[PDB]
Amino acid sequence: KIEEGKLVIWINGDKGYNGLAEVGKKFEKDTGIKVTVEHPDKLEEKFPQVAATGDGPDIIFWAHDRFGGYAQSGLLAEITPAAAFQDKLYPFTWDAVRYNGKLIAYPIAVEALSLIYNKDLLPNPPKTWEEIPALDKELKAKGKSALMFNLQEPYFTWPLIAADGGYAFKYAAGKYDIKDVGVDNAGAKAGLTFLVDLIKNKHMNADTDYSIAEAAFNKGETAMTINGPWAWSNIDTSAVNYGVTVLPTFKGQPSKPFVGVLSAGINAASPNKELAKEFLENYLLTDEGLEAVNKDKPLGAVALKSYEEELAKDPRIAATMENAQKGEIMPNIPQMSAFWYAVRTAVINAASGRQTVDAALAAAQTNAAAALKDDFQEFVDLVPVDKLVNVALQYLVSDKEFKEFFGYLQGEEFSAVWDQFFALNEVKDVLNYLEAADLAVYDALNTVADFLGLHHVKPTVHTLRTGGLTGFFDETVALLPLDKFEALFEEKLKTSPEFKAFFEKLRNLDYQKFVDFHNNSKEVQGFLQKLRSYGLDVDGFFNLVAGFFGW
Ligand SMILES: OC[C@H]1O[C@H](O[C@H]2[C@H](O)[C@@H](O)[C@@H](O)O[C@@H]2CO)[C@H](O)[C@@H](O)[C@@H]1O
Ligand SMILES: [Cl-]
Ligand SMILES: [Cl-]
Ligand code: NA
Ligand code: NA
């Protein structure tokens, strides 16, 4: 569990975590409370992993786009500043961290990518993407290259993809339409095609990552890079005389970076929420606190009005805000995780040659729009439903044990198990949730009820060999591609927020109420006894199920 009486903070290792630790030093000087600042890798994935178990940091720093999913998963405490504090930060930064009407983090700073260029190699940087191929030819004749930036993270390639028409989710009169994705329209294809052709023509290398591009630019090997304000400090340390300016245009349109608001959330499981609010409001989000972080690694245009009025005089910040104004604030909706994962795969596969731009973006378009109903269909698609029903039909008319038990299912005892199971408020909750997700679960269960109510079957010739109730389950499980299920299950938790959210709804279900249902109902107990009496390990089933959901 989270340790009480201290603060543990997670922030990405490219940010000013040493400056943040200096703020932690002042907090301890004043209060006696110790602050630990960590910067683990894959922070945006590590936090929901550990926080879901009730563990993790008291405070989590990341761009705001990830926080709606965290909040939906119940990982974040509501943020309720007093009026005077709220007024100290720009309204549009509070907007970035508002989800379902509640504030779910403190906004810190506005981040936008810019074009960073070597003034000595390139006194006049290009205004267009289209002229960069020729510039690289010219620079290649001098032992240099034109442009290197991180091609492993779609954050860096999105501004080009969006320039001539690409978009994540369509925004209209208030809301984002998570069914209207814009990653495979003509503008998106054109932008990614231009990136891939830069690689095909050897103006960039598909394996270039953050560290490679940073080293190349700061050691004077490449004339340009694309990065955010956090990167300026290392460039300062280098010998490079650099400028920060507007991103290049594509087809006459501005590059459109997805703008992030670095935000600080409080772990819902933290026993230190009051200390975290004091640290964030009265130590970090002050002129002195943000200056400490900013002098370590620049934050960008900070959310704090008083200090942004100083930083705004910096031409590098002017360029950051110019690029931000030409881009768009990221959504914070949970579906952003699907979007980023889909475009990540598309860019890497297209840049590697593994796929064409058209095929990679076509797959990303469908993946970014993933919905629970679509995910469920992929599981059904794996199941031979024709065969499963025939086994059930053969057993229903041919197998002695199956008939015995099917007959039991038509008595009062099971009728009461059935009516009482589906009267539980915990079960009705799941059914309505599925109906909200456009899965006709009531219709499906009433199809099962109509079948359990069967009194006559069409004539058929019986099968000669059946193996009782255990033989029925062995024969039907044998038709289930169980490895593919567990694989598909693992991918969907990564590619589909709605699938994860449904699993979380079951995981976080009040499992006790079901044990109450069992331990207090004689009809339920009998039902379970009968199953065991036919050789069916019901206990090994429930226990295995409880493990699946962590009950
Ligand atoms: O590349 C996808 C990734 O983009 C953004 O992450 C940024 C982050 O916002 C910046 O602060 C900086 O650290 O670079 C990261 C990209 O490497 C999204 O915020 C993130 O959720 C998304 O996965
Ligand atoms: Cl990287
Ligand atoms: Cl359906
Ligand atoms: Na307060
Ligand atoms: Na094309």
UniProtKB/Swiss-Prot annotation:
Q: What induces it?
A: Induced by maltose and the transcriptional regulator MalT. Permanently repressed by cold shock in a PNPase-dependent fashion.
Compartments (UniProt record): Periplasm
Q: What processes in GO biological process is this protein linked to?
A: carbohydrate transport; cell chemotaxis; detection of maltose stimulus; DNA damage response; maltodextrin transmembrane transport; maltose transport
Q: Which keywords, in A-to-Z order, does the entry hold?
A: Periplasm, Signal, Sugar transport, Transport
User: What protein family is recorded?
Assistant: Belongs to the bacterial solute-binding protein 1 family.
Gene Ontology MF annotations: carbohydrate transmembrane transporter activity; maltose binding
Q: Write down the SUPFAM superfamilies for this protein, in alphabetical order.
A: Periplasmic binding protein-like II
NCBIfam families tied to this protein:
PRK09474.1
Q: How does it assemble?
A: The complex is composed of two ATP-binding proteins (MalK), two transmembrane proteins (MalG and MalF) and a solute-binding protein (MalE).
Protein name listed in UniProt: Maltose/maltodextrin-binding periplasmic protein
Q: Which cellular component appears as one GO term in the record?
A: maltose transport complex
Pfam families in alphabetical order: SBP_bac_1 (PF01547)
Protein encoded by which gene: malE
Q: Which InterPro entries match?
A: Maltose/Cyclodextrin-bd, SBP, SBP_1_CS
Quote the function comment for this protein.
Part of the ABC transporter complex MalEFGK involved in maltose/maltodextrin import. Binds maltose and higher maltodextrins such as maltotriose.
